[PDB]
């Protein structure tokens, strides 16, 4: 009774953290989606011709003169660059939130039940 639930408790806590670790990190990948959308928001907001201080490399940054607002990237495919339209990229800047949020958010109730599966073992392990 108790030792098998001392042994079985091992994996369920990982199944917790398997789901706990994964869901938290996709918001980080969503950060860039609204970012690039917002980075494209204020991009179209001001104009072409504003100075752009853009990352050169660590401990440094390089200036630059913006000649294109409507020229904006999307990362889809595999290693691929699609420079898109200001609204196009925004749409995918937008839409890449939508699909990733689905894979992300689904993980939270499964987080609970793995603990509810572990917590159930905890009791029967303690009882």
């Amino acid at each position: 009774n108790l030792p098998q639930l001392e042994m079985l408790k091992n994996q369920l806590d990982q199944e917790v953290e398997f789901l706990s670790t994964s869901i938290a990190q996709l918001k980080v990948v969503q950060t860039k989606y609204v970012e690039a959308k917002d980075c494209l928001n204020v991009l179209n907001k001001s104009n072409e011709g504003k100075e752009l201080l853009v990352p050169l490399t660590s401990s440094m940054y390089v200036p630059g003169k913006l000649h294109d607002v409507e020229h904006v990237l999307i990362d889809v495919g595999t290693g691929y660059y699609v420079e898109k339209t200001a609204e196009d990229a925004k749409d995918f800047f937008k839409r890449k939130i939508d699909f990733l949020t689905k894979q992300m958010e689904k993980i939270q109730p499964a987080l609970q039940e793995k603990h509810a599966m572990k917590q159930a073992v905890m009791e029967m392990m303690s009882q």
Binding site: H71, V72, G77, T78, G79, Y80, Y81, V82, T85
Partner: protein
């Protein structure tokens, strides 16, 4: 026993970026879209190598078609080592379990 766990890392090894593919696989459908969605309105690039390669639709069109196909191709290499590693660790499980029990 280590025999239980032995081949599962080699297993999930080939499974690791194969999973990464299957998002790229999904986005390969999207780059097919976003290539078809790009008539040239804004530049199309296969980013391959630390050099940015100036690229074209038809240059990336077969490519993203080739990528998606290839991004299905690292699936089968794991499917090769899928049943390699999970099956032989399936025999190993009984081998040193009883010997250590013995």
């Amino acid at each position: 026993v280590e025999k239980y766990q032995q081949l599962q890392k080699d297993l999930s090894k080939s499974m690791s970026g194969r999973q990464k593919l299957e998002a790229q696989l999904t986005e390969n459908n999207i780059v097919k879209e976003e290539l078809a969605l790009l008539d040239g309105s804004n530049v199309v690039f296969k980013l391959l190598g630390p050099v940015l390669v100036k690229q074209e639709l038809g240059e990336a069109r077969a490519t993203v078609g080739k990528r998606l196909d290839y991004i299905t191709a690292e699936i089968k290499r794991y499917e090769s080592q899928l049943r390699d590693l999970e099956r032989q660790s399936e025999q190993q499980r009984e081998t040193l379990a009883q010997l250590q029990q013995e």
